[PDB]
Homo-oligomer: A and B are copies of this chain.
Amino acid sequence: KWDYKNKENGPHRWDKLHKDFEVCKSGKSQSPINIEHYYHTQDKADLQFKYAASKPKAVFFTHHTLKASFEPTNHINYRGHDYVLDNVHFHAPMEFLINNKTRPLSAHFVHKDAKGRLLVLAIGFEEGKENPNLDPILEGIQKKQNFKEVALDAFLPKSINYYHFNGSLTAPPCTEGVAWFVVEEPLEVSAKQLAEIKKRMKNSPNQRPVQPDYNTVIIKRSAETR
């Protein structure tokens, strides 16, 4: 039963808990890392968003995180191909570091294309003003069902800059082949919302430690989300 503690089931031993998890240790592009060495480009965008306000399929606690799953109606388009948004879920603290800076919370937007290839967008939160985009999720977890719309098309800023590289899932089975999009700009979250989200995740950090970095090639990129 894998977790984030430092006992028999912790991240240092995930590989021992099941054969499927062996890549958690043996892989050469495990995530997260500290993003510190990266390149710049003047190339045009290759990322477009096809998000719309959507009622979650489910809002629930699973795999140590608070997760909102969605019907397959939202997509990111990358290199001309659609990747359907499966879920949004949270990590506290944020898992990726950017020039050794941490954030107290991040969201992962998890996508998959028709071929089954994974694309994950990560974005951090900084403690600040109330973020009304989070309220349908907070209201939805403590509610039976009939979940309210999540404003997916208002969640990110208009313009984003992100770090783009290949890595892995940050929880078992740690599958590689992941295209990561780690957004530089933080969203806001209030102290109250931050406490509430952390409590829904059992006040138990669900941040995988940074993994060995085998010269990960990272390009800094921009895109418009509208």
Contact = CB atoms under 8 A, between A and B. Distances in A.
Interface of A: 23, 26-29, 37, 39-43, 46, 78-79, 117, 119, 164-166, 175-179, 214-219, 221
18 contacts: A28-B29, A28-B166, A28-B175, A29-B166, A29-B176, A39-B39, A39-B221, A40-B41, A78-B215, A166-B214, A166-B215, A166-B216, A177-B214, A177-B215, A178-B214, A217-B217, A217-B219, A219-B219
A28 B177 contact: yes
A28 B168 CA distance: 10
Contact of A217 (B37, B40, B164, B176): B164
A43 B39 contact: yes
B23 A26 contact: yes
Contact of A41 (B27, B29, B37, B39): B39
Nearest to A178: B214
Nearest to A116: B214
A100 B218 CA distance: 24
A117 B164 contact: no
